[PDB]
Every structure is written in structure tokens, then in C-alpha cells.
Design a protein around this ligand. Structure first.
Ligand SMILES: *[C@@H]1O[C@H](CO)[C@@H](O[C@@H]2O[C@H](CO)[C@@H](O)[C@H](O)[C@H]2NC(C)=O)[C@H](O)[C@H]1NC(C)=O
Ligand SMILES: *[C@@H]1O[C@H](CO)[C@@H](O[C@@H]2O[C@H](CO)[C@@H](O)[C@H](O)[C@H]2NC(C)=O)[C@H](O)[C@H]1NC(C)=O
Ligand SMILES: *[C@@H]1O[C@H](CO)[C@@H](O[C@@H]2O[C@H](CO)[C@@H](O)[C@H](O)[C@H]2NC(C)=O)[C@H](O)[C@H]1NC(C)=O
Ligand SMILES: *[C@@H]1O[C@H](CO)[C@@H](O)[C@H](O)[C@H]1NC(C)=O
Ligand SMILES: *[C@@H]1O[C@H](CO)[C@@H](O)[C@H](O)[C@H]1NC(C)=O
Lengths: 186, 698
């Protein structure tokens, strides 16, 4: 009858990569999709022969990254997005889905942000939305007109003429426990 | 926390904002350049202003991280690109004066008009009208009028501006911890690798005047052949053993000799390559030209275009009304955006220019993964050298015959090869001594080896000595002949063309050796060669993130500059010109000038000699000429400007000759001037209070 997996792929807007949200929570819509995906990398389980090991909970983390930043949403990866914005575990299972949205997310006058600077790397599934200024030595400078203090949240600066690699990509990450089963969804 | 733990964070903050601001500035500049209007010229001063302010602010903050205590090459070299400021260490009054001076020279060069000596109501600008006369006219007198009207109505306006420009630029460059403005121009070609074995600024001068001595026989034979063919036209005007006159070289300054090709054509019965008619007859357009260029670049292994190249970049004249300056150029806007702005036509030279600009794009596409400060050519020669070497393979009549433009029945004899090689040498070989001599003059002027009272004397001395070109009329220190060229009046480095030619032919030899070419170097096509594409692309990607010597070593297997590839390219032409210049004279003497045979030597035996006595002598000579022609019933108003002084030694002697007013080509005969002096010998030295023994008039 009903299987909630939509309303996350046809949403009118996605947040920035540093402000990703999840869903609590039908897999034939991945192949015959409204938008043809550019990245279909699935780790752990396979896309073909998928609905045989049933899962009791599915999380869908959705955000927007740069075109060259789609590579960094994968297990065991090093980058700005992996270290400071969005981290996946080394034993992550599930599929990573992405598609180009230069006609949608780059037309408006809105802005998309990413955390370039942070004090140390981030844990998997950790959200960091702080606007506190980053000092190279430490502490809080609270003054941009100084030395060693920079704004952490940098802007993608999306323009419809940037070309592939700097274009907006809407990334939706499906993650499963593969071992948690309180007998809820199967 | 420490240095090298915070300088990379500073460069991480810099790059991710400089990319955005540079992209906005480039977008505004493109929007102006394709849509020149009132509201689009205003937007560089709102975008480039923020970009320059951000660049100078981050350059001031970059000085807090010393170049010591950092070991990794990319961030240290990025700090080397920074720290060296975009904010000159110069006074506000002096900086405003320098900006006013540069604007004044640009305005004088752009809006300088030369009027005819008779009926002065029509006047010609340099690009409308004077370049047409310098390119197409075979008249001696019209060419001399256009050559002397320029540098006297324009160069005389540019002389004191250039003097104060030299002073202010030396003051500015000494504040950058250099010694000269020429040394500051040589901040490129400056590498350091290990143990002090890097390329120095002083090594560039040694390399270029070793290369210039290595190109002396080929250029001497080409000069002798051009001089021989410039005697069929212009009889009794060019000495068989002397230098070439400066106004008979195809343009205003003698930079390119390529407009002398109809006069000095070998085997004029054989037609040259011109695929324009077959280009029009096959229904080609701009899209077909650029798609064929992309097909050529794919065939070696270089990638496609970014698909924003085909959309954003214009490739035709705009049908809707939009004012555009139509100069072929390739745009690297940043953030993955590459564009070409050119108003191309269905023409063979437009085909080669499209290949040139797409070579620039493909060189720009390769180093996009580098940091923003290292997204440039490894030196100022590689970028244009890649651009020209990508167009050498497609101009050969084997790539043209493959595409179907050239008919298969075209005769590829050994005479068309000589025609092509001579046209190339007029384009390429004939501009190397000019470039070397002009940059040597500018370097010695900035260094101080040429005093301000010996600018024109030294300039024409080393123009005769190196280029082999003699001035048609004498120029004293009131003139400024270098400033009459665009690159000197607009403050542009000029040795990049010399290094462009050297690196272009070195790259051509390397890529043709890699692509297993068999025959001569000039008949080489690097198309359909993946091996050449790999070695090419491993050099374009490095950008500046590596010294130019070691990225030159990776492609041509030599760290140093070599001209052996260039001499091997023109080897059939060299051995043809050796046979052609067998009964002629190869070389020139710096003693002959067009005014040499009609000039009178005057020696001074002391009352003193200022510049106020030269004017008195010229006035006395002009009055003697008027008095002598008055008794011949020929009333002519000779003046001070009609008396020219050459070989001015201010202690002992000088030479002079008289020219008819309104006609700079009409030199008065030496017997007439001597008769005038003998007729008016009393009141030509009564004002000086000296007898005829002091001024002997040899
Ligand atoms: C070329 O430039 C003109 C202005 O120099 C552009 O005209 C502007 O178009 C915008 C579009 O919304 C208007 O808001 C402005 O009011 C217009 N200004 C003027 C003075 O007309 C024009 O659109 C540009 N054309 C292209 C193809 O870029
Ligand atoms: C590069 O190689 C390709 C394939 O080897 C050439 O393409 C074919 O060349 C033959 C011979 O001239 C033509 O008859 C075909 O019409 C071509 N096109 C095909 C098969 O699609 C290409 O001409 C070569 N280019 C150069 C510059 O050598
Ligand atoms: C200006 O002087 C030139 C050269 O003195 C004149 O051009 C011709 O020059 C040749 C030799 O150089 C003479 O034999 C001719 O008699 C000259 N005149 C012509 C009409 O050919 C030129 O005529 C003079 N006048 C102008 C207005 O240019
Ligand atoms: C380049 O584009 C053409 C057509 O657009 C395509 O056939 C070819 O495979 C492309 N090559 C590469 C390397 O992308
Ligand atoms: C071309 O070749 C022929 C015969 O080999 C020779 O006689 C002629 O001199 C050559 N011409 C040139 C310009 O090399």
C-alpha cells in the first residue's frame, strides 16, 4: 500500500551541506526516477537484489554540495566535506545518490554554505551549525579585523555558468543499520 | 598553531574567497567585452575594485607568514606570489603621478594623428590609415612621410612622459627589493630548487644574448635576401651592403617582415596555400571551425569542451546590436568556466587563430585543479608558445588535405616548402632581433647604463648593430622612437615573444619526435598521436606549481633554453638562402644611412657649445639656404626643422644635411649646400666670432 520513500527527492529546497537533516522512515523509484542520478555508488548492499534483507529503519540525509565535492560523500574519504561538513563511517552500508541541479539550485539568489574551518575533524553523523568565528590558534577572536581569524562558513557561490564541477548537486544518502531489528518494518 | 600550521589555513581562506571574487570580476569583464555600453563599463569599477582591494588586503596579511620555516613547495610558492605586493611601496602623490603618466601615454598613442605636409586637413590615426600605408604602400616618399610624421607628432609628446615614467617605475621597483624596473619585469624566469642551482634574473639576459648570437647567421642570410629583393623595387635607395631603411619593412616599427612577402616572394608562379575558397564552397561556418579544432584536440588525447564553452562563449559577430571590440582572445573566467571571445570568419587565418585560442583554452583547462595563485603559465612564454605550437601542425598541407579543404591534386613540390618557410621566417625569424634589441634597450634604460641624453643615440646605434636597420632621417634626443610602439607606451613586457618563439619551436621538435614523425620538421602533424598528447598534457597541468626549468625538462629533455629546434625548422630555408646569397653580400655595415652621402661633416675648433649654439648654427644654415636659393629665383622658406644633425659628438664634430620644406624625402644635394655655405661664409660664423679655420666644413 504505502511505503514512505518520496517527498525527499522532490522537495522544493535542500539545506547546505553543514545543515543536513535526516528522516525517520519502495525502491523501484531509484531506477525509474524523476531525475536521472549522476552518482549511484552503493556500498555494502547492492542496488540489484536489494529488497531481500529487510531493514527496520532508514535514514535519508539530504544536502547540496559542489560538483567536485560529490566524491567526498563515501566511506573512508578525506576532504573538507568529510572532515568538517558530513562524515560517513568506515563500515557504512547503503547507497549514495546525487544529481545535477544547476537549473534549480543555482538560478535563485540564495546561498549555499560549507564549513571550511573547524577545530578538529568531525565524527560520523555529527551536525555542526555553529557560526562562531574560527581562530587559528584557538579560542574565539570575535573580530574579523585581526590576524589568524577567519569566517568558517564559506559560500559555494552558485552561478548557472560555472560548468560541471562547480555546479550544485543534490545528494541524498540512504543509510541502514543492517543489524538493528526490533521487528517494526520488514 | 605555528608557521606552516597557519599559513596553509591562511591560503585556504584566501583561495575559497579569491575564487569567488575573481569569478565575479571576470564575469563583469566578459559582460563588458561582449556588450560594450555605458552601464557595462561601470561594472568593472564595482567588481574589479573589490577584487583589487581584497588582493591588496590579503597581500598585506601574507607578510605575517615568513618564507622561512615553511618547507612544502606549493604553499611557499603561493606565499611567494603573495607577499610581493599588489600595493606598490610608493608615495600617494607619486602613485597618482604614475597613473596619470600611464594614462597620458595610452591616450597619446591611441589618439595620435599624423597629417599630410600638403593639404593638412586630412590626418591619419595609427590603426585607421597609417598601418594601411605601412602595410600596403610601396611608395618610398609616402612611407617616409608616414614614418616621420609618427614619432615626431607622437613620440616627441611621449619623450618626457617616458623619462618621468622610467624614474617613477625605478622608484617603485626599488621598493619591491629589486634594483630596476627591468629586474622587476624579470621576477618571472626566477626559480629555486636546491643548493642555489635555480634560474636567476641575470641568467635570462645571458640566455637571450646567447640565443641571439646563435640565430645570427640565419637572420643575416634572411636580411641579405630581403635586401636583395628590396632592390628590384626601390632602386637607388637601398645600399647593396648597407642596412635596411626603417620605413621599408612592412610596418611602422619593422617588427614583423611578413608584409614584405609580395615583394620578396620566391617562385611567384607557384601559388601559396589558401583554403578559404574551399572553406566557403563547402558551407563552413564558425561552429564547423571550432568543432574541427575540438576534433583536432581530441585526436591527440586532450579533452572535449566543457559544454559551457559552446553556450556562454560567442563565436560569431552578434546579430543583435551590441558593440564589441573584435580581437581574438581566450577567457579563463575561473570556477570551471572557459570561454573564447572572437569575431571569426570563414578564413584560413581565422581557422588557425581558432586553433590558437583553443590551445590557450586547453592550456587553461589543465591547471584548473591547482590553487588560484598557481593557475597560470609556468613562465610568460609557455602560454603563448603552446598557443602557437598547437596551430603549427594544422597549417601543414597534410592536415588540410585530410579535412578535404585542400584538393588531392595540389602539388607539394620543394618550391612551396621554400615559400612557406620564407613566409614563416618573415613572421618568426625577422621579429627576433627586433624583440631582443628593444628589450635590451629597455633593460639598459631602466638599469641606467643608457643616460637620458643618449637614449636615441644608443637606440639607433644598437638598432643598426643588432637588427641591421638604419634610420632614414636623424633623430635627436627630442624624439622617442621606442615609445611609438604599443608595448612600450602601454607598459608591457616584450621578451615574452622571444621566449614564446624559442619554447614554441622546442615544443614542436619534442612533440614531433614523440609522434614518430619521419620527414622534415616543418611538414609535421601531431594529430592522431596519443603519445604526444600525454607528454603535452603533463606540462599544461603543472601550471606554475613547479619551476619552468624542470617542467621544460619533462617535455623537451633540457632544462635550458635551446634554439636548435628553431634552426632545424628553417634548415631547408637556410641552405636555400645560402645558395641564393652566393653572389651577394651577407651582412651589413653600420656606417651607411639614406642621408649619409648627402651630409656635410663639420668640425669644431672652439665660443663654447651648449644646445643654444646648435640652434644658432641651424638658423645660420637655414638662412644661408634661403639666401642661396633667393639668387636662383626659387623662394623657399628653409627653417631650423629643415636642418638635421647626425653623428653629434658635442666635443669635436658633427654631420648635417638640409631637407626641402614640406618634403622630408627631398634631401638637398651636397653640392647645393656647400655652394650655399661658400656663398654665405661670412655671416654663418660672424655670429660665433670665429674664422673659417675653426669650422672647416669638410
Ligand atoms: C547589454 O547591456 C545592456 C545595458 O548596457 C543590457 O540592458 C539591461 O538589461 C537588464 C536586464 O534586466 C535591465 O535590467 C537593464 O535596465 C538594461 N539596461 C539598459 C541600459 O538597457 C542588455 O540586457 C545587455 N544584453 C546582453 C545580451 O547581455
Ligand atoms: C585520424 O585517424 C582517423 C581514423 O584513423 C581518421 O579518420 C578517417 O580517416 C580516413 C582516411 O583519411 C577517412 O577515409 C575516413 O573518412 C575518416 N573517418 C572515419 C573513419 O570516421 C582521420 O582522418 C585521421 N586524422 C588525421 C589528421 O590524420
Ligand atoms: C618629394 O621628394 C621626392 C624625392 O626627392 C620626390 O619623389 C621623386 O623622387 C625621384 C627620385 O627619388 C625623382 O626622380 C622624381 O622626380 C621625384 N618626383 C616624382 C613625382 O616622381 C617627390 O616628387 C617630392 N614631392 C612630393 C610632393 O612628394
Ligand atoms: C567528445 O565529444 C564527442 C561528441 O560530443 C564524443 O563522441 C566523444 O566521445 C567525446 N570525447 C571525450 C573524451 O569526452
Ligand atoms: C627542387 O628540386 C629540384 C630537383 O631535385 C632542384 O633542381 C631544385 O633546385 C629544387 N628547388 C629548391 C627550391 O629546393
Amino acid at each position: 500500500n504505502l511505503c514512505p520513500f518520496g517527498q525527499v527527492f522532490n522537495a522544493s529546497n535542500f539545506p547546505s551541506v553543514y545543515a543536513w537533516e535526516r528522516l525517520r522512515i519502495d525502491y523501484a523509484v531509484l531506477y525509474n526516477s524523476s531525475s536521472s542520478f549522476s552518482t549511484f555508488k552503493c556500498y555494502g548492499v547492492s542496488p540489484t537484489k536489494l529488497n531481500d534483507l529487510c531493514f527496520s529503519s532508514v535514514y535519508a540525509d539530504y544536502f547540496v554540495v559542489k560538483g567536485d565535492d560529490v566524491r567526498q560523500i563515501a566511506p573512508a574519504q578525506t576532504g573538507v566535506i568529510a572532515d568538517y561538513n558530513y562524515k560517513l563511517p568506515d563500515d557504512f552500508t547503503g547507497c549514495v545518490l546525487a544529481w545535477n541541479t544547476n537549473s534549480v539550485d543555482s538560478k535563485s539568489g540564495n546561498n549555499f554554505y560549507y564549513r571550511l574551518f573547524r577545530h578538529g575533524k568531525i565524527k560520523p553523523y555529527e551536525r555542526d551549525i555553529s557560526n562562531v568565528l574560527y581562530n587559528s590558534a584557538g579560542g574565539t577572536c570575535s573580530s574579523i579585523s585581526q590576524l589568524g581569524c577567519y569566517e568558517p562558513l564559506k559560500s559555494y557561490g552558485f552561478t548557472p555558468t560555472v560548468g560541471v564541477g562547480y555546479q550544485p548537486y543534490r545528494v541524498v544518502v540512504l543509510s541502514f543499520e543492517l543489524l538493528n531489528a526490533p521487528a517494526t518494518v520488514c | 598553531s605555528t608557521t606552516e600550521d597557519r599559513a596553509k589555513i591562511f591560503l585556504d581562506n584566501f583561495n575559497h574567497e579569491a575564487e569567488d571574487l575573481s569569478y565575479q570580476s571576470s564575469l563583469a569583464s566578459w559582460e563588458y567585452n561582449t556588450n560594450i555600453s555605458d552601464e557595462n563599463v561601470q561594472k568593472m569599477d564595482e567588481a574589479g575594485a573589490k577584487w583589487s582591494a581584497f588582493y591588496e588586503e590579503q597581500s598585506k596579511l601574507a607578510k605575517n607568514y615568513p618564507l622561512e620555516e615553511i618547507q612544502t613547495v606549493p604553499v611557499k610558492l603561493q606565499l611567494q606570489i603573495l607577499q610581493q605586493s599588489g600595493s606598490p611601496v610608493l608615495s600617494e602623490d607619486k602613485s597618482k603621478r604614475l597613473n596619470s603618466i600611464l594614462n597620458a601615454m595610452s591616450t597619446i598613442y591611441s589618439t595620435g594623428k599624423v597629417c599630410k605636409p600638403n593639404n593638412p586637413q586630412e590626418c591619419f590615426l595609427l590603426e585607421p590609415g597609417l598601418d594601411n600605408i605601412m602595410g600596403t604602400s610601396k611608395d618610398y616618399n609616402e612611407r617616409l612621410w608616414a614614418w616621420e610624421g609618427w614619432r615626431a607628432e607622437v613620440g616627441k609628446q611621449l619623450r618626457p612622459l617616458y623619462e618621468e615614467y622610467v624614474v617613477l617605475k625605478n622608484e617603485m621597483a626599488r621598493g619591491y627589493h629589486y634594483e630596476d624596473y627591468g629586474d622587476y619585469w624579470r621576477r618571472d624566469y626566477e626559480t629555486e630548487e636546491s643548493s642555489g642551482s635555480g634560474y636567476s634574473r641575470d641568467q635570462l639576459m645571458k640566455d637571450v644574448d646567447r640565443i641571439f648570437t646563435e640565430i645570427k647567421p640565419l637572420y643575416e642570410h634572411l636580411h641579405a635576401y630581403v635586401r636583395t629583393k628590396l632592390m628590384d623595387t626601390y632602386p637607388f635607395h637601398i645600399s647593396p651592403t648597407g642596412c635596411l631603411p626603417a620605413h621599408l619593412l612592412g610596418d611602422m616599427w619593422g617588427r614583423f617582415w611578413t608584409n614584405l612577402y609580395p615583394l620578396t616572394v620566391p617562385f611567384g608562379q607557384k601559388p601559396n596555400i589558401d583554403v578559404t575558397d574551399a572553406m566557403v564552397n563547402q558551407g563552413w561556418d564558425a561552429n564547423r571551425i571550432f568543432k574541427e579544432a575540438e576534433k583536432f584536440f581530441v585526436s591527440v588525447g586532450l579533452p572535449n569542451m566543457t559544454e559551457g564553452f559552446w553556450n556562454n562563449s560567442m563565436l560569431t559577430e552578434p546579430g543583435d546590436g551590441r558593440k564589441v571590440v573584435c580581437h581574438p582572445t581566450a577567457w579563463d573566467l575561473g570556477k570551471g568556466d572557459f570561454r573564447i571571445k572572437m569575431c571569426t570568419k570563414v578564413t584560413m587565418e581565422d581557422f588557425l587563430t581558432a586553433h590558437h585560442e583553443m590551445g590557450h583554452i586547453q592550456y587553461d583547462m589543465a591547471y584548473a585543479t591547482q590553487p588560484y595563485l598557481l593557475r597560470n603559465g609556468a613562465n610568460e612564454g609557455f602560454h603563448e608558445a603552446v598557443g602557437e605550437v598547437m596551430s603549427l601542425s594544422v597549417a601543414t598541407p597534410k592536415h588540410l588535405k585530410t579535412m578535404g579543404l585542400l584538393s588531392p591534386d595540389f602539388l607539394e613540390d620543394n618550391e612551396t616548402e621554400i615559400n612557406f618557410l620564407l613566409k614563416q621566417a618573415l613572421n618568426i625569424v625577422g621579429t627576433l632581433p627586433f624583440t631582443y634589441m628593444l628589450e635590451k634597450w629597455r633593460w639598459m634604460v631602466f638599469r641606467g647604463e643608457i643616460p637620458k641624453e643618449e637614449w636615441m643615440k644608443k637606440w639607433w646605434e644598437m638598432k643598426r648593430d643588432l637588427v641591421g636597420v638604419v634610420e632614414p632621417v636623424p633623430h635627436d634626443e627630442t624624439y622617442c622612437d621606442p615609445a611609438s610602439l604599443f608595448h612600450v607606451a602601454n607598459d608591457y613586457s616584450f621578451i615574452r615573444y622571444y621566449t614564446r618563439t624559442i619554447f614554441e619551436f622546442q615544443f614542436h621538435e619534442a612533440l614531433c619526435r614523440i609522434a614518430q614523425h619521419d620527414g622534415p620538421l616543418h611538414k609535421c602533424d601531431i594529430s592522431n598521436s596519443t603519445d604526444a598528447g600525454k607528454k603535452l598534457h603533463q606540462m599544461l597541468s603543472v601550471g606554475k606549481s613547479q619551476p619552468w626549468t624542470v617542467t621544460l625538462k619533462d617535455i623537451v629533455d633540457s632544462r635550458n633554453m635551446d634554439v636548435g629546434p628553431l634552426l632545424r625548422y628553417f634548415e631547408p630555408l637556410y641552405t636555400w638562402l645560402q645558395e641564393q646569397n652566393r653572389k651577394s653580400h651577407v651582412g651589413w655595415n653600420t656606417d651607411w644611412s639614406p642621408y649619409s652621402d648627402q651630409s656635410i661633416k663639420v668640425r669644431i675648433s672652439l665660443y663654447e657649445w651648449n644646445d643654444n649654439e646648435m640652434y644658432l648654427f641651424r638658423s645660420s644654415v637655414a638662412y644661408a639656404m634661403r639666401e642661396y636659393f633667393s639668387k636662383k629665383n626659387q623662394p623657399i622658406l628653409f627653417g631650423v626643422e629643415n636642418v638635421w644633425v647626425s653623428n653629434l659628438k658635442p666635443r669635436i664634430s658633427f654631420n648635417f644635411h638640409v631637407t626641402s620644406p614640406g618634403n622630408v624625402s627631398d634631401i638637398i644635394p651636397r653640392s647645393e649646400v656647400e655652394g650655399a655655405i661658400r656663398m654665405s661664409r661670412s655671416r654663418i660664423n660672424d655670429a660665433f666670432r670665429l674664422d673659417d679655420n675653426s669650422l672647416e666644413f669638410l
